[PDB]
């Protein structure tokens, strides 16, 4: 007791918190959406909300399949949630087989039902349904498997999730049933915004219970990561959430473990790990981030008739995410009895076999100077576009450069990011394809590093060239509009064994800014510059120089 480095405010957290290296090193986790919503097997965690909305397809489905809302409520699925085939060790063997490094079971979704040993919430999996501590058994299994344990909380939305049950006859109108939460209106605001309009989305009781909920998860299971759904960022909840963050980060100091909080918006990108959709951006993000997707094409939780995705598209996206400083949190949805389907076991096993061969380029890597090259919205056709071998993503680790082609070719590729205009004194020492015993034939040209693919595929899906090089490389510059000027961003990598001095020069509309940078041996860094007196960002004339060699000019 006594540890109080962190106070429940933003400036205190930012003063003392750093995103841990294990998260950056890990890259890949498995999300497991499993709960009472698995029983109807409709494929929606929002079953509990829409079943009470008169006329909604789920409402109509429920009334015919299970009965009127006054006789069969969401709570009445819970006795059926027996989980006769749940086995935590079996789950962890599937997770471990994927090559993932952490696991994120759902500790509590929006529906009010705790999947763990809760003291205040009598709607829990120890007392009801499975009659076991699902989260506790998964924590023990994860320790034995040698992975890191996280979990997700979606309880904040329980404050309003059952609001439609008050508008039509149903058991939600019996306000003594606490599973159904505060029955408030959903907060206003579209998408990821802290604005809530005239409905706060929480109240005093739900805020206090959120602290009881997160405190007991922290105290009982000491998770290394806690993921939260989107409404914890609405303005009225932020004081409560900062109290949670301080308690979690202070506890973690005592545990001698560094921890991660995920949120979708509302909090600084340095005091937590953003969990965000993948943009259209090719850019490397400065801070580590996470993005989530399901193995199922249709759903996250289990539904009959699910069509699962192919390992190829998942792996291609995974590599793209990793090249841009992201982690992939990939979801499986077990059946209500606790069985992970053969199809999803197979997808995870294929990813794991890919990582067995190619993981050197993934685990522990960091973004290079630039994440991607190659050709890769509103199309009024089905174009059937796929990646080609010329679509390349980059990572670096231990001064090695990994160039990952997202498809195969019988010919060659030319790595354009190693074109001579980006390079000073670059010499290639070796090139190999991970998993290949064949010697790679390659040649440096002015246009880049030409690399001939070997004869046999070591793996499907994506193919890694490991490149050992010396020299200094700069990325192509990025331009961002600032008032009366422009911000220029590059990354520089010194692959030499000795420190290097580099000069960058941005000449925009005749205004010249220069910076000299000492880049430590076998290291890389962001460099930002700013040109002034730019009348028009769209009409600007731009030249960028790397040690007085022209790297870029907006020629077209």
Tokens standing for residue 148: 């890191």
Q: Please give the structure tokens belonging to residue 22.
A: 């294990």
The region of 30-38, 74-82, 400-408, 471-479 touching Ca ion under the rule CB under 5 A is 400-408
Question: Which 3 state secondary structure label does DSSP give 514?
Answer: strand
Measured CA to CA, the distance from residue 458 to residue 408 in angstroms comes to 11
Maximum Cα interatomic distance, the chain, rounded to a whole number of Å: 78
Question: Rounded to the nearest whole angstrom, what is the least distance from the CB of residue 28 to Ca ion in the complex?
Answer: 17
To Ca ion, the closest distance from the beta carbon of 386 in angstroms equals: 7
Nearer to Ca ion by C-beta: 136 or 454?
A: 454
Residue number, 316 or 360, with CB nearest to Ca ion: 316
Residue located via tokens 């993005």: 291
Any contact of residue 413 with Ca ion (CB under 5 A)? no
Query: How many residues does the structure list for the chain?
Result: 556
Question: DSSP class of residue 436?
Answer: -
Q: Between 127 and 312, name the residue whose CB sits nearer to Ca ion.
A: 312
Q: Minimum distance between the CB of residue 405 and Ca ion, rounded to whole angstroms? A: 8
Q: Judged by CB under 5 A, does residue 389 bind Ca ion?
A: no
Encoded tokens for 513: 């800014």
Name the one range near Ca ion by CB under 5 A: 87-95, 404-412, 433-441, 541-549: 404-412
**Taking the complex as a whole, how short is the minimal distance between the CB of residue 12 and Ca ion, in angstroms?**
45
> Smallest gap, in angstroms, from Cβ of residue 407 to Ca ion?
5
Residue 524 interacts with Ca ion (CB under 5 A): yes or no: no
Closest approach of Cβ 419 to Ca ion, in Å? Answer: 24
CB closer to Ca ion, 24 vs 309: 309
Instruction: Label the pairing between strands 260-263 and 225-228.
Output: parallel
For Ca ion, what does the binding mask look like between residues 292 and 331, x meaning CB under 5 A? --------------------x---x---------------
After which residues, if any, is the chain broken (C to N > 2.5 Å)?
376
Regarding 406 and contact with Ca ion (CB under 5 A), the answer is yes
Residue nearest to Ca ion according to CB distances in the complex? 316
Nearer to Ca ion, 349 or 407 (CB): 407
Each residue 460-479 as x (binds Ca ion by CB under 5 A) or -, in order, gives: -x------------------
| Helix, strand, or coil (residue 324) | coil
Find the part of the chain contacting Ca ion (CB under 5 A) among 146-154, 370-378, 396-404, 453-461.
453-461
Report d(CA 217, CA 47) in Å as an integer: 25
Residue with tokens 């009659």: 131
Q: Is 317 one of the annotated binding-site residues?
A: no
- Is 316 labelled a binding residue? yes
Nearer to Ca ion, 110 or 324 (CB): 324
Q: Which is nearer to Ca ion, 127 or 460 (CB)?
A: 460
391 near Ca ion, judged by CB under 5 A: no
Nearer to Ca ion, 407 or 450 (CB): 407
Rounded CA separation 512/542 (Å): 10
Residue 355 marked in a binding site = no
Q: State the minimum distance, in angstroms, from the CB of residue 294 to Ca ion.
A: 19
Q: Which stretch binds Ca ion (CB under 5 A): 86-94, 190-198, 348-356, 454-462?
A: 454-462
Rank residues 71 and 457 by Cβ distance to Ca ion and give the closer one: 457
Q: Cβ of 275: how many Cβ atoms within 10 Å?
A: 23
Site for Ca ion in 92-131 (CB under 5 A): none
Minimum Å gap between C-beta 316 and Ca ion is 4
Which residues 258-277 are close enough to bind Ca ion by CB under 5 A? none
Q: Under the criterion CB under 5 A, does residue 392 sit at the interface with Ca ion?
A: no
DSSP 32: E
- Smallest gap from Cβ 461 to Ca ion, in A, equals 5
406 is in an annotated binding site: yes
**Piece of 41-49, 116-124, 291-299, 458-466 that binds Ca ion (CB under 5 A):** 458-466
35 with 134: CB under 8 angstroms?
A: no
Q: Which uninterrupted H or E stretch holds 506?
A: strand 500-508
By DSSP bridging, strand 478-482 and strand 442-445 are: unpaired
Size of the site for Ca ion (CB under 5 A): 5
Distance CA 473, CA 419 (A): 9
Assess contact for 524 and 399: CB atoms under 8 A: no
Instruction: For the CB of residue 465, give the shortest distance to Ca ion in the complex, in Å.
Output: 15
- Residue 159 to residue 206: CA distance in whole angstroms: 6
The closest of 153, 129, 151 to 142, measured between CA atoms, is 151
Kindly tell me the burial class for residue 64, based on how many C-beta atoms sit within 10 Å of its own C-beta (0-12, 13-18, 19 or more).
exposed
Q: Compare residues 299 and 358 and give the one whose CB is closer to Ca ion.
A: 358
Closest by CA position to 145, among listed 92, 97, 223:
92
Site stretch for Ca ion (CB under 5 A), options 10-18, 303-311, 319-327, 398-406: 398-406
* Minimum CB distance to Ca ion smaller for 225 or for 404: 404
Residue 75 Cβ, how far from Ca ion at the closest point, in Å? 45
Q: What is the DSSP string of 106-167?
A: EEE-TTS-BSS--SS-SSBTTTSTT-S-HHHHHHHHHHHHT-EEEEEE-GGGGGTTTGGGGS
Q: With the CA atoms of 59, 64, 67 and 70 taken in that order, what torsion angle do they form, in degrees rounded to the nearest 10?
A: 40
Residue 233: which residues within 8 A CB-CB, separation 6 or more? 192, 194, 241, 263, 264, 265, 266, 267
Give me the residues that bind Ca ion (CB under 5 A), please.
Answer: 312, 316, 406-407, 461
Binding residues for Ca(2+), as ranges, are: 312, 316, 406, 461
């Amino acid at each position: 007791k006594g540890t109080d480095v962190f106070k429940a405010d933003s400036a205190s957290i930012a003063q003392n918190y750093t995103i841990p290296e294990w998260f950056k090193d890990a890259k890949f986790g498995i999300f497991i959406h499993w709960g009472v919503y698995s029983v109807p097997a409709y494929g929606s965690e929002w079953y509990s909300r829409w079943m009470y909305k008169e006329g909604h397809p789920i409402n109509k489905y429920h009334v015919q399949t299970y009965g009127p809302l006054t006789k069969f409520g969401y709570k009445d699925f819970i006795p059926m949630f027996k989980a006769e085939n749940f086995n935590a060790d079996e789950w962890l063997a599937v997770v471990k087989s994927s090559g993932a490094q952490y696991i994120v079971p759902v500790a509590e979704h929006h529906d009010g039902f705790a999947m763990y040993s809760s003291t205040f919430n009598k709607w829990n999996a120890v007392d009801m349904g499975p009659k076991r501590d699902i989260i506790g058994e998964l924590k023990e299994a994860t320790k034995k498997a040698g992975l890191r344990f996280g979990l997700s909380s979606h309880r904040c939305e329980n404050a309003w999730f059952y609001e439609y049950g008050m508008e039509t006859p149903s058991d939600v109108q019996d306000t003594t049933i606490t599973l159904y939460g505060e029955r408030l209106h959903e907060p206003e605001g579209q998408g990821m915004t802290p604005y809530c309009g005239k409905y706060e989305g929480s109240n005093e009781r739900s805020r206090r219970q959120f602290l009881m909920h997160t405190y007991e998860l922290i105290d009982k299971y000491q998770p290394e990561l806690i993921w939260f759904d989107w409404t914890v960022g609405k303005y009225p909840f932020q004081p409560t959430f900062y109290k949670f963050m301080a308690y979690y980060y202070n506890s973690a100091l005592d545990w001698n473990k560094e921890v991660v909080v995920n949120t979708k918006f509302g909090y600084g990108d340095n005091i937590q790990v953003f969990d965000i959709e993948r943009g259209k951006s090719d850019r490397i993000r400065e801070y580590p981030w996470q993005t989530d997707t399901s193995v199922g094409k249709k759903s996250w939780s289990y539904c009959v008739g699910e069509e699962n995705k192919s390992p190829d598209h998942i792996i291609d996206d995974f590599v793209d995410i990793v090249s841009k400083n992201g982690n992939l949190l990939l979801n499986i949805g077990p059946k209500a009895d606790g069985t992970i389907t053969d199809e999803q076991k197979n997808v995870l096993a294929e990813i794991g076999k890919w990582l067995k061969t190619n993981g050197e380029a993934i685990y522990g890597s960091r973004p290079w100077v630039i994440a991607s090259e190659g050709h890769n919205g509103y199309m009024t056709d089905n174009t059937k576009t796929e990646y080609t071998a010329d679509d390349i993503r980059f990572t670096t680790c231990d001064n090695n450069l990994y160039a990952v082609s997202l498809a195969w070719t019988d010919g060659s590729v030319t790595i354009k990011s190693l074109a001579t205009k980006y390079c000073r004194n670059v010499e290639i020492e070796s090139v190999e394809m991970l998993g290949s015993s064949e010697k790679i034939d390659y040649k440096m040209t002015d246009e880049g590093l030409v690399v001939n693919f070997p004869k046999n595929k070591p793996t499907e899906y994506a193919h890694v060239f490991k490149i050992k090089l010396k020299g200094v490389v700069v990325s192509k510059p990025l331009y961002d509009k600032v008032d009366n000027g422009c911000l220029i961003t590059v990354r520089v990598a010194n692959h030499n064994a000795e420190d290097a001095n580099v000069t960058l020069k941005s000449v925009v509309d005749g205004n010249e800014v220069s910076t000299q940078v000492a880049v430590k041996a076998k290291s890389e860094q962001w460099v930002k510059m700013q040109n002034k007196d730019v009348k028009s960002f769209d009409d600007m004339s731009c030249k960028f120089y790397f040690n007085d060699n022209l790297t870029y000019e907006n020629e077209f």
